[PDB]
Amino acid sequence: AEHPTLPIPALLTPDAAGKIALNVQTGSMKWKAGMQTPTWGINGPLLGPAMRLQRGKDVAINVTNALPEATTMHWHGMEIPGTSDGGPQAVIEPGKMWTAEIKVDQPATTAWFHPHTHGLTGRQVAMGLGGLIIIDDEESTKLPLPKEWGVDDVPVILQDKRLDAKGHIDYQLDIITAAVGWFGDMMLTNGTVYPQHLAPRGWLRLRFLNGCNARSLNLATSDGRPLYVVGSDGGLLGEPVKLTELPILMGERFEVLVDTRDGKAFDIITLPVKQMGMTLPPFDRALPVLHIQPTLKSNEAKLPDALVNMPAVPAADNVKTRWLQLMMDPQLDMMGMQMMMQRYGMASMAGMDSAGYDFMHGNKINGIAFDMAKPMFDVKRGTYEKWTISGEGDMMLHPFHIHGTQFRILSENGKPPAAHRSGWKDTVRVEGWRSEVLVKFDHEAPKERAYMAHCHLLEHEDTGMMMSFTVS
Ligand SMILES: [Cu+2]
Ligand SMILES: [Cu+2]
């Protein structure tokens, strides 16, 4: 067999009482011969279950902390009130249980969940915490898309990790990772190195998630067969997008369709990206992350000409704007790259080049390294706003994530959004230039449980590149 079977997260629907029980517990995985790596998982030794929720239905998620240290649980992509998201203002202490009441009110999507612990988000995600949120609505159900979970509707969580000599997860929040992020030399696909999936002939639906702390990926097929993007971060697109290459940022989700009709086996590969620290082996060349082997069986699934009603971007005439300036300390930034170059070689650079030595507060937004006690502003609920997030005077990649909403990108790093990226998204690329998004917060977030907006390169977020804001 050699290629191990791609693990499928257990589907988890709400019980009769309308509740979902999540147990954040310790475990272990086997990735290197000899030693077993100590890991953390939700309802298991690594990653988590796929919570399937129906639009309109209420649910109370009961997160119990079976870990030696405190953790939190962000429902990434959920249009919910701040009083239900749980971040640094809703800490789940060891041995205790935290409840999150959610009333699903958003299109059918592949959303996800992960810890959002103050200054430890990168560490806890690297440790193996994470999981999926499958939202179903009426409009999507009518479509002839693959629906058989784990057979033709398959989740693909792509994460990179690095192990030490003692077979432990080598996580660091040091001078290097504060600048370029935590990258590894091992490529996990649902926690498995190069898995294999047996799919029926016809159409294969892959719910992709870039669960890397800092690594951006560029998905493609081994034989050059196109990938049909049908869904983005917060819902299906208006119509599918035919692509040969699909770049995916940290915390992004792309639902794609692949033609398995010919029955030929092929690989889902990741192409080397132009990002600092990410060009080292095994990522220096095209890397197969998932082997697809078509079975003799078939499905009646088809690629629809039109998916769902995609509203037009409203012309927000005199809406409030917000300038969010991401900032990095050059003195620390330079030391990080010098240390990266020394430890990993010149290849690390990927062909590239008000202060303090406060590495834990080196990265900021609008001059401030995340102050939980001071939200930047208050937004009126149900109003449109035009937010510009800038990354000038800094060459790093910043996938900007915004809590409690799904937005439409107006400008992505200068140029307009790509075909697939013009739908509903909660993450926007900010790399060396400025981006503009059209946001609207339909749910409140008080000072006590405020929303956040941060860079999804977890190490930048843990070193201060995060801001909070209220909605009322
Ligand atoms: Cu997230
Ligand atoms: Cu960043």
Side-chain angles (χ1 to χ4, degrees), residues 348-368:
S348 47
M349 293 299 306
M352 314 190 232
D353 312 289
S354 277
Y357 271 97
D358 207 329
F359 79 107
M360 286 307 301
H361 312 88
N363 310 139
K364 307 168 190 168
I365 298 183
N366 291 339
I368 310 119

mmCIF file of all heavy atoms in Angstrom, residues 348-368:
data_model
loop_
_atom_site.group_PDB
_atom_site.id
_atom_site.type_symbol
_atom_site.label_atom_id
_atom_site.label_comp_id
_atom_site.label_asym_id
_atom_site.label_seq_id
_atom_site.Cartn_x
_atom_site.Cartn_y
_atom_site.Cartn_z
ATOM 1 N N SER A 348 16.719 30.000 1.684
ATOM 2 C CA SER A 348 15.630 30.420 2.554
ATOM 3 C C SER A 348 14.981 31.715 2.071
ATOM 4 O O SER A 348 13.766 31.778 1.943
ATOM 5 C CB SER A 348 16.119 30.553 3.996
ATOM 6 O OG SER A 348 17.344 31.261 4.109
ATOM 7 N N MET A 349 15.801 32.683 1.672
ATOM 8 C CA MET A 349 15.368 33.978 1.176
ATOM 9 C C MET A 349 14.420 33.974 -0.025
ATOM 10 O O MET A 349 13.775 34.993 -0.263
ATOM 11 C CB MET A 349 16.590 34.832 0.847
ATOM 12 C CG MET A 349 17.386 35.216 2.061
ATOM 13 S SD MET A 349 16.446 36.200 3.250
ATOM 14 C CE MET A 349 15.864 37.523 2.229
ATOM 15 N N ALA A 350 14.335 32.865 -0.790
ATOM 16 C CA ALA A 350 13.466 32.752 -1.975
ATOM 17 C C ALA A 350 13.759 33.801 -3.064
ATOM 18 O O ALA A 350 12.865 34.177 -3.826
ATOM 19 C CB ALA A 350 11.993 32.786 -1.577
ATOM 20 N N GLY A 351 15.011 34.244 -3.128
ATOM 21 C CA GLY A 351 15.463 35.250 -4.079
ATOM 22 C C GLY A 351 15.056 36.665 -3.714
ATOM 23 O O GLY A 351 14.581 37.418 -4.568
ATOM 24 N N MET A 352 15.213 37.040 -2.435
ATOM 25 C CA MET A 352 14.820 38.373 -1.963
ATOM 26 C C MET A 352 15.921 39.049 -1.074
ATOM 27 O O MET A 352 17.029 38.507 -0.949
ATOM 28 C CB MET A 352 13.448 38.305 -1.247
ATOM 29 C CG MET A 352 12.383 37.485 -1.989
ATOM 30 S SD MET A 352 10.716 37.632 -1.293
ATOM 31 C CE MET A 352 10.290 35.967 -1.093
ATOM 32 N N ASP A 353 15.622 40.230 -0.464
ATOM 33 C CA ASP A 353 16.575 40.976 0.375
ATOM 34 C C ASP A 353 16.194 40.992 1.854
ATOM 35 O O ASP A 353 16.534 41.930 2.575
ATOM 36 C CB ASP A 353 16.713 42.421 -0.128
ATOM 37 C CG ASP A 353 16.922 42.520 -1.627
ATOM 38 O OD1 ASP A 353 18.032 42.156 -2.099
ATOM 39 O OD2 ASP A 353 15.971 42.951 -2.335
ATOM 40 N N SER A 354 10.498 55.078 16.769
ATOM 41 C CA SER A 354 9.727 53.871 16.444
ATOM 42 C C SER A 354 10.619 52.622 16.235
ATOM 43 O O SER A 354 11.010 52.368 15.090
ATOM 44 C CB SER A 354 8.880 54.104 15.194
ATOM 45 O OG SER A 354 7.658 54.756 15.502
ATOM 46 N N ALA A 355 10.939 51.842 17.320
ATOM 47 C CA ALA A 355 11.764 50.650 17.159
ATOM 48 C C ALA A 355 11.587 49.543 18.355
ATOM 49 O O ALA A 355 10.651 48.720 18.279
ATOM 50 C CB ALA A 355 13.236 51.052 16.887
ATOM 51 N N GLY A 356 12.457 49.543 19.398
ATOM 52 C CA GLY A 356 12.536 48.568 20.482
ATOM 53 C C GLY A 356 13.229 47.291 20.037
ATOM 54 O O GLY A 356 13.427 47.068 18.831
ATOM 55 N N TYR A 357 13.678 46.467 20.985
ATOM 56 C CA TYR A 357 14.114 45.106 20.639
ATOM 57 C C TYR A 357 13.113 44.065 21.198
ATOM 58 O O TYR A 357 13.437 42.904 21.405
ATOM 59 C CB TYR A 357 15.555 44.820 21.022
ATOM 60 C CG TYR A 357 16.525 45.191 19.920
ATOM 61 C CD1 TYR A 357 17.186 46.413 19.928
ATOM 62 C CD2 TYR A 357 16.772 44.326 18.863
ATOM 63 C CE1 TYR A 357 18.079 46.757 18.922
ATOM 64 C CE2 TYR A 357 17.655 44.665 17.844
ATOM 65 C CZ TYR A 357 18.302 45.886 17.872
ATOM 66 O OH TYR A 357 19.178 46.217 16.862
ATOM 67 N N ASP A 358 11.874 44.509 21.393
ATOM 68 C CA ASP A 358 10.731 43.834 21.954
ATOM 69 C C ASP A 358 10.181 42.839 20.952
ATOM 70 O O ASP A 358 9.162 43.107 20.320
ATOM 71 C CB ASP A 358 9.705 44.926 22.269
ATOM 72 C CG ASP A 358 8.775 44.574 23.370
ATOM 73 O OD1 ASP A 358 8.476 43.373 23.528
ATOM 74 O OD2 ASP A 358 8.349 45.494 24.097
ATOM 75 N N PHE A 359 10.836 41.673 20.809
ATOM 76 C CA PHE A 359 10.421 40.711 19.801
ATOM 77 C C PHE A 359 8.969 40.257 19.976
ATOM 78 O O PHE A 359 8.280 40.029 18.972
ATOM 79 C CB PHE A 359 11.398 39.544 19.699
ATOM 80 C CG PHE A 359 11.251 38.506 20.770
ATOM 81 C CD1 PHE A 359 10.702 37.268 20.485
ATOM 82 C CD2 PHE A 359 11.688 38.751 22.059
ATOM 83 C CE1 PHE A 359 10.582 36.305 21.469
ATOM 84 C CE2 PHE A 359 11.564 37.785 23.046
ATOM 85 C CZ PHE A 359 11.008 36.573 22.746
ATOM 86 N N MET A 360 8.475 40.221 21.233
ATOM 87 C CA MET A 360 7.091 39.825 21.467
ATOM 88 C C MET A 360 6.060 40.876 21.085
ATOM 89 O O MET A 360 4.875 40.565 21.055
ATOM 90 C CB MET A 360 6.881 39.364 22.899
ATOM 91 C CG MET A 360 7.461 38.002 23.171
ATOM 92 S SD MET A 360 6.952 36.660 22.046
ATOM 93 C CE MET A 360 5.204 36.679 22.269
ATOM 94 N N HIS A 361 6.502 42.120 20.805
ATOM 95 C CA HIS A 361 5.664 43.263 20.399
ATOM 96 C C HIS A 361 6.240 43.995 19.170
ATOM 97 O O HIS A 361 5.932 45.162 18.963
ATOM 98 C CB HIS A 361 5.489 44.245 21.569
ATOM 99 C CG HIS A 361 5.105 43.574 22.849
ATOM 100 N ND1 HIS A 361 6.061 43.085 23.718
ATOM 101 C CD2 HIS A 361 3.883 43.262 23.332
ATOM 102 C CE1 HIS A 361 5.397 42.535 24.720
ATOM 103 N NE2 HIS A 361 4.085 42.611 24.529
ATOM 104 N N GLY A 362 7.056 43.294 18.378
ATOM 105 C CA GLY A 362 7.742 43.831 17.214
ATOM 106 C C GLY A 362 6.842 44.107 16.036
ATOM 107 O O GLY A 362 7.128 44.999 15.228
ATOM 108 N N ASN A 363 5.761 43.335 15.910
ATOM 109 C CA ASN A 363 4.824 43.528 14.809
ATOM 110 C C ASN A 363 3.573 44.183 15.344
ATOM 111 O O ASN A 363 3.105 43.809 16.402
ATOM 112 C CB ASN A 363 4.543 42.214 14.116
ATOM 113 C CG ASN A 363 5.802 41.477 13.750
ATOM 114 O OD1 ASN A 363 5.889 40.259 13.888
ATOM 115 N ND2 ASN A 363 6.819 42.202 13.309
ATOM 116 N N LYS A 364 3.102 45.234 14.689
ATOM 117 C CA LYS A 364 1.980 46.044 15.161
ATOM 118 C C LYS A 364 0.961 46.341 14.044
ATOM 119 O O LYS A 364 1.158 45.957 12.892
ATOM 120 C CB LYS A 364 2.539 47.384 15.730
ATOM 121 C CG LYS A 364 3.619 47.215 16.780
ATOM 122 C CD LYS A 364 4.328 48.500 17.083
ATOM 123 C CE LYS A 364 5.551 48.275 17.944
ATOM 124 N NZ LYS A 364 6.425 49.484 18.021
ATOM 125 N N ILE A 365 -0.146 47.002 14.414
ATOM 126 C CA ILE A 365 -1.182 47.509 13.526
ATOM 127 C C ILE A 365 -1.456 48.922 14.024
ATOM 128 O O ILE A 365 -1.732 49.101 15.208
ATOM 129 C CB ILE A 365 -2.478 46.656 13.505
ATOM 130 C CG1 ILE A 365 -2.197 45.220 12.997
ATOM 131 C CG2 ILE A 365 -3.545 47.361 12.656
ATOM 132 C CD1 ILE A 365 -3.376 44.329 12.855
ATOM 133 N N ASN A 366 -1.293 49.925 13.154
ATOM 134 C CA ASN A 366 -1.502 51.333 13.481
ATOM 135 C C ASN A 366 -0.646 51.823 14.644
ATOM 136 O O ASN A 366 -1.109 52.625 15.456
ATOM 137 C CB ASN A 366 -2.980 51.634 13.715
ATOM 138 C CG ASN A 366 -3.806 51.548 12.470
ATOM 139 O OD1 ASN A 366 -3.289 51.640 11.351
ATOM 140 N ND2 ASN A 366 -5.112 51.377 12.630
ATOM 141 N N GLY A 367 0.586 51.324 14.731
ATOM 142 C CA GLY A 367 1.514 51.713 15.782
ATOM 143 C C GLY A 367 1.368 50.958 17.083
ATOM 144 O O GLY A 367 2.231 51.078 17.954
ATOM 145 N N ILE A 368 0.289 50.170 17.239
ATOM 146 C CA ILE A 368 0.065 49.421 18.473
ATOM 147 C C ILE A 368 0.202 47.913 18.315
ATOM 148 O O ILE A 368 -0.426 47.327 17.435
ATOM 149 C CB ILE A 368 -1.301 49.763 19.102
ATOM 150 C CG1 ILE A 368 -1.501 51.273 19.218
ATOM 151 C CG2 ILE A 368 -1.467 49.075 20.455
ATOM 152 C CD1 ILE A 368 -2.651 51.751 18.470
#
